[model samples]
Target: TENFFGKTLAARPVEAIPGMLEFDIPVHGDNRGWFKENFQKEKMLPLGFPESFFAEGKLQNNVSFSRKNVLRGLHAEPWDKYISVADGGKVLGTWVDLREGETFGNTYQTVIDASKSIFVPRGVANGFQVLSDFVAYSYLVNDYWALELKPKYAFVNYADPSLDIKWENLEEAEVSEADENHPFLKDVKPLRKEDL
Candidate 1:
């Protein structure tokens, strides 16, 4: 089973499962414009994180209108991820606990609209579907980024029902081939919170 912790920092929805946790970064706005702190090192450190663990921040700009379903990934290896919407209106974020020891495996998903940010730990398979014609920015941190470490990890298909997720509601999604080829979805067991 999964549980929720910490104070809510933003709107939208947030959920936690095993080694993975998701939260929304609150956005404050006024007549002139909107102001929000998308990333804050101080807040995260108190949650038992060291600043060094954060390797670097990256941004992704997506443009698509197929409503044809964009599937980004299901990778679990050397890389851990943090994703948020930079500019756009609709998005759905999904995560699967591929770790063998987890209890809530084969069933985990979260919908991240424009109002929230998501934080995911290593060993969890993650991906997103675009809900509108917009751009998305994501930050990645990994001990290794090369293909050597890639083969050691498994990959899964986004459409696999064993993972149990729906991606069509996401309006306009853009994805890469690398994300579509993870192997975890095919061979991994379901996960639960206690296993984390």
Candidate 2:
């Protein structure tokens, strides 16, 4: 148990993957209210995170909006994150590990609401399917993403043959034009990385 603002909280590492964690922040009075110190420099620094980890706290909170059944990604960049749902929606956050020299093609996913969160490491491709309306996906990123810079394999098309994700019952769901025009895995020539 860990203490946060006088309240004791539970923090545990995910067994399936290192650096991934879940923080059980308690909500009181209702789902809409609670104080969370979800990101802390002291606690996280000892866990092997780089020195530049929490510098962007002022610019870190990136809230994204979504309609029901909206599928946003399978996207990855050079950063890490701790994510959760806010407001009144539940979301199914999914990701496929593409960590350099670590592992590839293994999938990880979980349903996140107000009381729970999932942390994702860099190089992992992540996406979300809203299971409820008016969902606000709050993402705390370790770095800034302008998207102009990326890996040879950054965006993963929803229909990409290499991806191991297939959402059920969203045949009528909506996607952005950018996502609709991404390159599939089969379309790209194979490439390799040495120091990644």
Candidate 3:
């Protein structure tokens, strides 16, 4: 309710399809520099959740930097992700609801600046494009990035027609052969119930 740290609390839903969450970063400054507390376990826990929320998950953090027009991924698997912007510009974050429920096929799109963070559920496919000349993006995952095991792991085509998302600057877009070669949403097997 008061701020993201839960110094006080509020009912802020949409966190990491088993969940997704986006909240503004609280930045403070003095004559020297600016500072922000990007992660606070308290903020991620649902009000009714017990401390087991942290006990059952392994935490791994990843940081990456991309230049303008560089498109990264539309990948997902059996794990939760907490994404945040560390520096340099912004991005257009997009995800599709592949979770097995009424929300299946639902899609979301948003412009993410350094002021906020996003959480994507295990079953949802996610991707983002750098909107500035350069961008530094970081994410924390409950599980490791081990899609090599296959199973429900699938790469989603960013331009899938069913999702109908608009790319930020298609003419200037750059992607790896792998990024451009992913299969359409319909081609993948349905995700397992546990992924949700």
Candidate 4:
């Protein structure tokens, strides 16, 4: 547990990779609705996050209640992330540690009913499965997304895990053909923190 400048950037340990350091947002509620300051540069800057690197939020809506079981990924883009449940509830957030030189690597799992917002740094592969009928909002910051900047990162995936992941069970997971046909997992390497 680490608290900084009145903000909670708690470090969470994962089973197969390095732990995550996340800042807790302040949520205020009343009869009408709820209000919270989702992100602020000054608060995060002291916690080792650059204000310019933070991404704006994006919203996603899933209408159907489908069981997504297959291991959809071991994938990461150049974008860093801040994910939270804006409305409704019930979601299983999943993350995998593909960071090189970390204590735990090639590990992945799901987070249950995680309504609290989390910050996922670049190079970490993450996604979620809806456990209820709801919508999800994600905030992503990437150098490539900026019109003034050039794209500096590449994306990769694991169709097969060298350490043995349950790929068959997650077969129902809907993914693009490119992800489905990705090269062998053994060919994939973890990304360094600086690489992002």
TM-scores, all candidates, are 0.69, 0.74, 0.83, 0.61
**Model 1 alpha-carbon drift over 4 Å, by segment:** 1-16, 47-68, 169-196
- Once fitted onto the true fold, the runs of candidate 2 whose alpha carbons sit more than 4 angstroms away are 1-8, 14-17, 30-52, 55-59, 151-153, 166-168, 185-196
**Residue 158, candidate 4: how far off, in angstroms?**
7.0
Q: How does residue 140 of candidate 4 score in lDDT?
A: 42
Q: Is candidate 3 or candidate 4 better by lDDT?
A: 3
Clashing pairs in 3: 1-9, 1-10, 14-20, 15-19, 15-20, 16-19, 17-121, 18-196
Q: Return the top candidate by TM-score.
A: 3
TM-score winner between 1 and 2, please give it. Answer: 2
Query: What alpha-carbon RMSD in Å does predicted model 3 have with respect to the real structure?
Result: 4.0
- Candidate 4, residues 1-196, lDDT tens digits: the string is 5321234443344445444444455556569766666555566567655454534443222222334442334456566666565554545555655566644245454443333565566667765555554544445444344543223333345444454343433545666676666545345466766765
Top lDDT hit: 3
Per-residue CA lDDT of candidate 2, range 1-196, in tens?
Answer: 5332243445677554555666665544346556555556576555544454455553467889898888887776566777877665787777766554345556667777776767776666778888887698887776666545455446667656556666744576678888777667445323234312
- The worst-scoring run of ten residues by lDDT in candidate 1 lies at 59-68
Question: What RMSD value applies to candidate 1?
Answer: 6.5
Better of 2 and 3 by TM-score: 3
The alpha-carbon RMSD values of the candidates against the true structure, listed in the order shown, are 6.5, 4.6, 4.0, 6.5
In order, what lDDT does every prediction score? 0.55, 0.65, 0.71, 0.51
List pairs with backbone clashes in candidate 4: 16-104, 17-104, 55-141, 69-170, 70-170
